Design a protein around this nucleic acid. Structure first.
Ligand SMILES: NCc1c[nH]c2nc(N)[nH]c(=O)c12
Ligand SMILES: [Mg+2]
Lengths: 1337, 79, 103
DNA sequence: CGTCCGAAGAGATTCAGAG
DNA sequence: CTCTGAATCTCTTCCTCGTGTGGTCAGGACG
RNA sequence: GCAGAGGUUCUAGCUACACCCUCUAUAAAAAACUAAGGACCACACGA
């Protein structure tokens, strides 16, 4: 129907047009009559008839009188929906300002008038006079005058002095104000003004005034002369609370406003005293203020059960607010809830649905089928038949239930898998049954969990459900290309019992014809499940593409593994079943099945796995018992030894040898060591404890203990839980975070002491509360991520952008945290991937990386692959399909139109519940050590000491890959040469992190240039060295005279001729910071490369992720050099340490106000590159984006987010974070206007400025210059072009005011405001409709 | 009955497009008096439409040709 | 399970014309909230989302129509415009902000 | 029978001491 | 000596659904 | 309700989106047609 939604400030004439009447009387209705009052808040004449087609008089009824206003009633007969359709207005005796424009963050009305807000509420609430049109008087028109000062000015000046009070005074001020004249005045002022803060204020004001100029809005329209009133259906006031028929709501606020307006009108009519008139105007203004927005005033109108009365804005905004309350989430028909039940007998695609629930859910379908059958002649008869519940109705239900898929929704829908459609199967029980494999996908349990069940109706809806919603379609989680239907608890245990080996069991050593014979032997009981036999296996190999080659061979496997082989389809190899088949093993099996065979064979395989696992787990008879728990015999001895050690440390503390803190640390260390020893002994006596006679000598075998079976198989509970169960629980930190000195030495099997239980409950309650706030913060973060990244859909198949992020495995030096295979999987290459051998192109320029390509890269050991990213694609309001890569859920290139943004937001948000809210370079293995960006000078010993602090020690193995990568600081000693093989386990570098040695460029003696001992920096004895040292004093440490002179260490010859630094004419002078230890005195020689001076020297959970996505400024951000240049001190840390950085080619030096206390990582006289860290600290993402490229900040933030997630063991593909990053930097600031229409001091969407740049490049015009600007997810969502979408996220008031003032017009086209509108969204099945609609323009 | 749509997505690459093309065929089968080309094994119209896509009997281009042919047939009926 | 089991095909609606009143005591339907909307939104689900938003929640004409179509045997959904959106429009217009659907 | 009577994070707001 | 960055003073959010219980104004004469 | 009028029934039933029948001054012979007022706040519980 409509094509775009338009919002603008409403004029009083426009309001009169909407209104059909004026509400003169406050009382809404006469309760005894239950009839709308003639001038009342509910009036049939003003809005519409209370009873449809009934006049208040009742003279005109239904048809033949419809549309005609009977004079006596005064009400036109119309449908009752006209009540909510038709609006009204209330005349206000005093014009009253709209609080939303009156009070806001930037104070629209205050910003226009250049007046402090305080003056504004003073004049609005009649506390002072604004002297409008001072004229001949000294006061100007805009000034504010005090009441007594107003009287004095009246005495001094008469008709010329025209100070006035109230909202109408401000309206007159705005009317006198001219938009265009003040616009050019502001432009001239901005040209003249040279203060960037004053310039910022002027830019804000000029943007506001230009928004008024372009939009059809008037400043005086901000003050409401006429106040519209809500329709009566919207505020029905018809609660019928036991005949009371009354309640306290917005109607009360309207009543108060009308009462105040009537009082003011009658006071004006009666010529009331001016003080009383102004007080009444204050009351009316406050009433309208609270009505439009309660709490903006600062005083909340109350009296509804002594609770704040909800204002119209309050209904408009927040979860209570309708847009969140209903528009975003609407309750639906054909829906129901019930508890969950397992019912394994169901197939994966189908589910269990209660018989009674289905009859209610599918009742319209049942009525239709009955009518078509002719069993029900009429629909009323069909309704009666459903109530009767005759057998015929149940047969009709079976037909409707057969192919209408039902959506099953878990209560917290963190991810898309939360809602999955299933084919409903009628069940006698009153509980919905969910197939067991998909229960893990839902993250739901059977602890009375409840699922909402919805019934899609239309053929489009049913086809959509079957095609996409159905569980069989979503084998792989959208977050990671891994099976989300991985077997969870019982089937994995049953398979692990099945796929297990025993040294000796009945049937061992037999030869079996086939897996069928293995099953027959097992059922006969002649051979146990876990006895090894020599049985042939006919495995089909998919080596021929699309052809199965049968191979039959004798393989030494257990009977159980042979039986399970029947379940496995022909394509898969037999090696996968030959292992123990725990949880990761079965997940890998399912992944291989999906990769090699089709999805349907994978579904059948998964269902057969579940059935076989449940059956053989039941037959296994796995059981947990007290005797099953094993307590190591060495546990008590270890505990006694630990207690003796603790007593020894206590004696040392009493003797005074060890301090209280050191004693506490030693106690913690020894208790941790004892806990580790207890755990190791328990594992040794649990995992391999069983010794079984094996046709001869007894042989130790992996133990069949049920609890160890559960832990090792991964069915449920890690090794830590078992260690808490049978081994001593260990150290339990008290709630603040400090570890209790005495741990819990008693395992759960033994009785825990009362104090031990109290200590444990400390941490237990801490964890429970922290988990509650985890859920809260995870919900908030998920909402923010959805709102910022809602407007992301695949719109172009291929951008063709050659640019892309560089993808490399991440290594912290200890290990390769993320292998390259997983990171680049399902990602289209940015360019041709050449072999490490030069000029050999292994991978083409644009090819999607499936498993074969990723393996091929691994064989050729391509360490670094440059790959396309969503940030790289040049599509506006969309993403390249190739750039996004694989769908990660269907194992192929992302299909056009799929909404990747919401997928990624849900994928990131979901693990937040699991996320917890609260030197010597060792080389692992032999390889070539490599140094990059290294500035090292050999010392007297010849070992390499590096001035550069950006250099990294990335070791390269024989294949060419970076096995380990390390970082060395300023003046870091390097034991082994660069580029040569180093033996595993040796220390490559041996710097001391505490010290900060400064290397010497040229061998010579030191000289005191501004380092004179007498003025300051006097020799201070160093006890550890045994020699007095001329330590340089810090500015606060030294006297005022010392601050003026900046120390410079000149190097000279024996005679005294200065020795220049190599490559530069100036003598080698080293600028020494405060507290730098200058051990060597004047006239003491220093060898080249030796140390001339030595300078002595974060959240990991969900808050860290929130900080990263919000791009919040760290407390001490690391300073980065704006441009390559020479460093020097502008000031001696006077007020703020001033730093000058000037390049040789660039005249203009970047200037920084570095804090005095902050340590300077860079040497004072050092020459550094752009983006190099200047002060040690957390790097600011905004600075990273400004200095480096968008690709570099993308890599930084992705790495940090993944590292936070990698700690908790949850894997998320990088593209999910990447799209959120792309949405974060959607807004781009323009460096220079050029020929573009946008002013240089403006921020516009990067897409729009890119389109403008393409337009200017196509013709003969200057291209625009834009600086990419990182925005927090909350800010980016709030700053989106679609004002409806921004209002949905947060802070509806500010967004609505900004849209109204600027006259913003949303062109829909966003994935969310289409949800609010309710039309087709530009999602997968709506993208075609949206593009057809757009081309229809 | 088609419990897996993977073969149908092979026939229509977009998959989301497969829902739209199947919907038009299914609407023709139910609201209109259009014979199911695929044999009906006690199947609802939506499943028959999916089966027709898997068979290759119905594709977006084929549906368009049949609709155009019906429009020509209407002109012949007008005479 | 007797208390927690609930379902409705058609039932009484509120003043905001959200057809499901909500809650088991009243004959009310489960809230298809923001998380559920985003879940279907991440999927290719558009027709189901549109149907749930419009014809199953708030359409004075669509809810009545859809019922007639289903009892007639054809599952055709008339989109219309949600009544809650008109409520939003009238409320914002009452606040003094001219909000309108331009063509 | 009407009928009047913490918390945390962030954006304005001072404000200010310093080059 | 007029604006630094810095201290200060309001504004907005702080999951997501169920299920039960309850309690509720404006505003009384008045011709 | 062909327009006016009356209407079997299967609450009420020319509009709610409505719809059909017979009849000529006024009701009585007949089958097929269709969804209802619930606001707010606290407590508790379950996920
Ligand atoms: N709503 C119309 C109506 C009222 N009584 C009726 N009786 C019959 N036979 N037919 C009808 O159509 C009606
Ligand atoms: Mg649960």
């Amino acid at each position: 129907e409509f094509d775009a939604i338009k919002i603008a400030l409403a004029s009083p004439d426009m309001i009169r047009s909407w209104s059909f009447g004026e509400v003169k009387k406050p009382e809404t209705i006469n309760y005894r009559t239950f009839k709308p009052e003639r001038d009342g808040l509910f009036c049939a004449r003003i809005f519409g008839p209370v009873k449809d087609y009934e006049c208040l008089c009742g003279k005109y009824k239904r048809l033949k009188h419809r549309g005609v206003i009977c004079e006596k009633c005064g009400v036109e007969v119309t449908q009752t929906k006209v009540r909510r359709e038709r609006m009204g207005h209330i005349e206000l005796a005093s014009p009253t300002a709209h609080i939303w424009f009156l009070k806001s963050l930037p104070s629209r009305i205050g910003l226009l008038l250049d007046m402090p807000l305080r003056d504004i509420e003073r004049v609005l609430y009649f506390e002072s006079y604004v002297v409008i049109e001072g004229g001949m008087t000294n006061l100007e028109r805009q000034q504010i005058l005090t009441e007594e000062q107003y009287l004095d000015a009246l005495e001094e000046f008469g008709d010329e002095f025209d100070a006035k009070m109230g909202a109408e005074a401000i309206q007159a001020l705005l009317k006198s104000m001219d938009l265009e004249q003040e616009c050019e005045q502001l432009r001239e002022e901005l040209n003249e003004t040279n203060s960037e803060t004053k310039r910022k204020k002027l830019t804000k004001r000029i943007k506001l005034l230009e928004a008024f100029v372009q939009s059809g809005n008037k400043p005086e329209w901000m003050i409401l002369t006429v106040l519209p009133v809500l329709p009566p259906d919207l505020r029905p006031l018809v609660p019928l609370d036991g005949g009371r028929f009354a309640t306290s709501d917005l109607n009360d606020l309207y009543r108060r406003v009308i009462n105040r307006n009537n009082r003011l009108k009658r006071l004006l009519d009666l010529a009331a005293p001016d003080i009383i008139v102004r007080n009444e105007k204050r009351m009316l203004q406050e009433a309208v203020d609270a009505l439009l927005d309660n709490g903006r005033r600062g005083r909340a109108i109350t009296g509804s059960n002594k609770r704040p009365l909800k204002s119209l804005a309050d209904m408009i905004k927040g979860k209570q607010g309708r847009f969140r309350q209903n528009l975003l989430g609407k309750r639906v028909d054909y829906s129901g809830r019930s508890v969950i039940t397992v019912g394994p007998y169901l197939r994966l695609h189908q589910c269990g649905l209660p018989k009674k629930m289905a009859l209610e859910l599918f009742k319209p379908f049942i009525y239709g089928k009955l009518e078509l059958r002719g069993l029900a002649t009429t629909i009323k008869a069909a309704k009666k038949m459903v109530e009767r519940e005759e057998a015929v109705v149940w047969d009709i239900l079976d037909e409707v239930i057969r192919e209408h898929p039902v959506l099953l929704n878990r209560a917290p829908t963190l991810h898309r898998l939360g809602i999955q459609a299933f084919e409903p199967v009628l069940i006698e029980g009153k509980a919905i049954q969910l197939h067991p494999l998909v229960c893990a996908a839902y993250n739901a349990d059977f602890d009375g969990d409840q699922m909402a069940v919805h019934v899609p109706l239309t053929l489009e809806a049913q086809l959509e459900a079957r095609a996409l919603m159905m569980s069989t379609n979503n084998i792989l989680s959208p977050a990671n290309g891994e099976p989300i239907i991985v077997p969870s608890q019982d089937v994995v245990l049953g398979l692990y019992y099945m796929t297990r080996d025993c040294v000796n069991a009945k049937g061992e050593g037999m030869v079996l014809t086939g897996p069928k014979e293995a099953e027959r032997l097992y059922r006969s009981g002649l051979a146990s499940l876990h006895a090894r036999v020599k049985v042939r296996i006919t495995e089909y190999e998919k080596d021929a593409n699309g052809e199965l080659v049968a191979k039959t061979s004798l393989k030494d496997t257990t009977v159980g593994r042979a039986i399970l082989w029947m379940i496995v389809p022909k394509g898969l190899p037999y090696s996968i079943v030959n292992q123990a088949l725990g949880k990761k093993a079965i997940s890998k099996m399912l992944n291989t099945c999906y990769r090699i065979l089709g999805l349907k064979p994978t579904v059948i395989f998964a269902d057969q796995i579940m059935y076989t696992g449940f059956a053989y787990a039941a037959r296994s008879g796995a059981s947990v018992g007290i005797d099953d728990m094993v307590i190591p015999e060495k546990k008590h001895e270890i505990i006694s030894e630990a207690e003796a050690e603790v007593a020894e440390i206590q004696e040392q503390f009493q003797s005074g040898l060890v301090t209280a803190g050191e004693r506490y640390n030693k106690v913690i260390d020894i208790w941790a060591a004892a806990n580790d020893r207890v755990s190791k002994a328990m594992m040794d006596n649990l995992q391999t404890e069983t010794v079984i006679n094996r046709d001869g000598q007894e042989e130790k075998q992996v133990s069949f203990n049920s609890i160890y079976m559960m832990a090792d198989s991964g069915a449920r509970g890690s090794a830590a839980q078992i260690r808490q169960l049978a081994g001593m629980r260990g150290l339990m930190a008290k709630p603040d975070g400090s570890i209790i000195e005495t741990p819990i030495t008693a395992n759960f099997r033994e009785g825990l002491n009362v104090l031990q239980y109290f200590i444990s409950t400390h941490g237990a309650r801490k964890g429970l509360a922290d988990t509650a706030l985890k859920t809260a913060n995870s919900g908030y973060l998920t909402r923010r991520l959805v709102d910022v990244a809602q407007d992301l859909v695949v719109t172009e198949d291929d951008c063709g952008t050659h640019e892309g992020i560089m993808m490399t495995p991440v290594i912290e030096g200890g290990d390769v945290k993320e292998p390259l295979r997983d990171r680049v999987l399902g990602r289209v290459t940015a360019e041709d991937v050449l072999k490490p051998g030069t000029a050999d192109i292994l991978v083409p320029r644009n090819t999607l990386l499936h498993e074969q390509w990723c393996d091929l890269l691994e064989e050729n050991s391509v360490d670094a692959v440059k790959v396309r990213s969503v940030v790289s694609c040049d599509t506006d309001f969309g993403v390249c399909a190739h750039c996004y890569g694989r769908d990660l859920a269907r194992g192929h290139i992302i299909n056009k139109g799929e909404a990747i943004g919401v997928i990624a937001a849900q994928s990131i948000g979901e693990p937040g519940t699991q996320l917890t809210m609260r030197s010597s370079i060792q080389v692992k293995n032999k390889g070539s050590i490599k140094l990059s960006n290294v500035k090292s000078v050999v010392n007297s010993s010849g070992k390499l000491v590096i001035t550069s602090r950006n250099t990294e020690l990335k070791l390269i193995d024989e294949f060419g890959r970076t096995k380990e990568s390390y970082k060395v600081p300023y003046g870091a000693v390097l034991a082994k040469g660069d580029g040569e093989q180093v033996a595993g386990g040796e220390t490559v570098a041996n710097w001391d992190p505490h010290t900060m040695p400064v290397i010497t460029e040229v061998s010579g003696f030191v000289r005191f240039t501004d380092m004179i001992d007498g003025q300051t920096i006097t020799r201070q004895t160093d006890e550890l060295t045994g020699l007095s040292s001329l330590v340089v004093l810090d500015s606060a440490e030294r006297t005022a005279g010392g601050k003026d002179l900046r120390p410079a260490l000149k190097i000279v010859d024996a005679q005294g001729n200065d020795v220049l630094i190599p490559g530069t004419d100036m003598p080698a002078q080293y600028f020494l910071p405060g507290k730098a230890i200058v051990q060597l005195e004047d006239g003491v020689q220093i060898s080249s490369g030796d140390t001339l001076a030595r300078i002595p020297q974060i959240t990991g959970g969900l808050p860290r992720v929130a900080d990263l996505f919000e791009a919040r400024r760290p407390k001490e951000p690391a300073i980065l050099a704006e441009i390559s240049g020479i460093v020097s001190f502008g000031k001696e840390t006077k007020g703020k340490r001033r730093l000058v950085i000037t390049p040789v080619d660039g005249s203009d030096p970047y200037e920084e106000m570095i804090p005095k206390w902050r340590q300077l990582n860079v040497f004072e006289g050092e020459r550094v590159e752009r983006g190099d860290v200047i002060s040690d600290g957390p790097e600011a993402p905004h600075d990273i984006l400004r200095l480096r490229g968008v690709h570099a900040v993308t890599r930084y933030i992705v790495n940090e987010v993944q590292d936070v997630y990698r700690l908790q063991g949850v894997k998320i593909n990088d593209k999910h974070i990447e799209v959120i990053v792309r949405q974060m930097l959607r807004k781009a600031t323009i460096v220079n206007a050029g020929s573009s229409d946008f002013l240089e001091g403006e921020q516009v969407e990067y897409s729009r400025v890119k389109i403008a740049n393409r337009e200017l490049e196509a013709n003969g015009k200057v291209g625009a210059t834009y600086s990419r600007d990182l925005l927090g997810i909350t800010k980016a969502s709030l700053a989106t072009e679609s004002f409806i979408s921004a209002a949905s996220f947060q802070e509806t008031t500010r967004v609505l005011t900004e849209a109204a003032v600027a006259g913003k017009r949303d062109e829909l086209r966003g994935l969310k405001e289409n949800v609010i509108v309710g039309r087709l969204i530009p999602a997968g099945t709506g993208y075609a409709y949206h593009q057809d609609r757009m081309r229809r323009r | 009955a088609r419990v897996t749509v993977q073969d149908a997505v092979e026939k229509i690459g977009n998959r989301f497009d497969l829902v739209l093309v199947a919907a038009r065929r299914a609407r023709q089968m139910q609201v209109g008096g259009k014979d199911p080309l695929v044999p009906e094994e006690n199947d609802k119209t939506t499943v028959i439409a999916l089966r027709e896509i898997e068979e290759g009997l119905i594709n977006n281009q084929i549906l368009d040709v049949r609709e155009r042919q019906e429009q020509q047939e209407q002109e012949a009926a007008e005479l | 399970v007797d208390d927690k089991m609930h379902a409705r095909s058609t039932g009484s609606y509120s003043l905001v014309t959200q057809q499901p009143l909500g809650g088991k005591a009243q004959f009310g339907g489960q809230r298809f909230g923001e998380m559920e909307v985003w879940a279907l939104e991440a999927y290719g689900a558009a027709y189901t989302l549109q149907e749930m938003l419009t014809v199953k929640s708030d359409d004075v004409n669509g809810r009545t129509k859809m019922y007639k179509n289903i009892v007639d045997g054809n599952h055709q959904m008339e989109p219309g415009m949600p009544e809650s959106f008109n409520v939003l429009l009238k409320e914002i217009r009452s606040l003094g902000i001219n909000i309108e659907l331009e063509d």
